[PDB]
Write a protein that binds this DNA or RNA. Structure first.
Ligand SMILES: *C(=O)c1cnc2ccccc2n1
Ligand SMILES: *C(=O)c1cnc2ccccc2n1
Ligand SMILES: [Co+2]
Ligand SMILES: [Co+2]
Ligand SMILES: [Co+2]
Lengths: 8, 10
DNA sequence: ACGGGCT
DNA sequence: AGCACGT
């Protein structure tokens, strides 16, 4: 849910 | 980080 | 369920 | 070389 590197 | 030492993130 | 981004 | 995240 987070997008810190993927943002799923 | 930073840059340097993106972000995090981006 | 998913890996990004320059000094 | 340097960084952990949640819908
Ligand atoms: C987003 O909130 C979130 C939480 N857990 C995960 C586990 C694995 C892949 C993606 C995820 N995204
Ligand atoms: C983004 O590519 C990425 C990779 N690993 C992580 C670990 C913990 C929090 C966030 C992250 N983001
Ligand atoms: Co991973
Ligand atoms: Co990466
Ligand atoms: Co989690």
């Amino acid at each position: 849910x987070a997008x810190v590197x993927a943002x799923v | 980080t930073x840059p340097g030492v993106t972000x995090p993130g981006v």
